[PDB]
Assembly symmetry: C3
Amino acid sequence: RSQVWAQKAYEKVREAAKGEGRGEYRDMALKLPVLVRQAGLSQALAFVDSGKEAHKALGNDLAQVLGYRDLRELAEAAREAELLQYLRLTREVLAAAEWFKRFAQALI
Amino acid sequence: MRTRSQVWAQKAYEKVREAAKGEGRGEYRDMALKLPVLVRQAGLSQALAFVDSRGKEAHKALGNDLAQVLGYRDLRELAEAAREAELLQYLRLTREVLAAAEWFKRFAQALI
Amino acid sequence: MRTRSQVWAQKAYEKVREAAKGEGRGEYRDMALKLPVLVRQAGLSQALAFVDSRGKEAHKALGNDLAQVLGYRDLRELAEAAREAELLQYLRLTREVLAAAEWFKRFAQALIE
């Protein structure tokens, strides 16, 4: 799984590194992990869900990697989840976000 | 039994011992195993509300037993203490409940 | 020139040396030692509200001193700034207050018995 996440994140980041909004994508990629850790999953996703296209691009890519159709669907899932599933989703988002962060710092 | 934590451990030990005998010992254990992370990651109030809203009697018994180990009549009473507490008292109850929950988890693992 | 955190460290140092001369320095130290913990476990907003609702002058003084070290008028201005801050600014403010608080704690441990 981590490898599937590693691969998918790498794929998304490579594709993002060819766009004019790479620096902004990178900024969001490196910031999301700490946001999820300190503000909690739902607050972090709401922050991403709210200006520049590049920032939300990270959220959507990450959501897709997790098998969700878009950032909103992941946000919807986190809010609908019962407590145990919420913590599981947080752990999952955190792990996948670290990959986006690492490949973003290496490829951008 | 000198230690305060040790006192909670021995009382928790007795509760788990009882629970291991009846039916639903598996569900009790399942809850005993998750309560610590619930308290750590979600906070005391949410953790207790989760346990108190579970359908299974075995899941709620864990909470009831932990409350009694800490000096409360039951989970409802413990949850009320948490909602009435001022900040320092709430953080203290949080540490208290977490410590007791860890003992329940450990003994459930060894006895059920 | 001194780094940002170095400035806070030294201003905190001055605030503590001054509290060491007044009455209630023991209560001042108690609050200084407890604040970092509250910010980490309860969050910035909650930690600040706890300090502001204290009835003992020495406890509240720690709060106003820290806010001044950070460049605010007093605890009330810092608290409002925390409530109005959007997420990133709130997390950044949290880091700053926690860093300043740790210095108050450290100097209280060294200067107030």
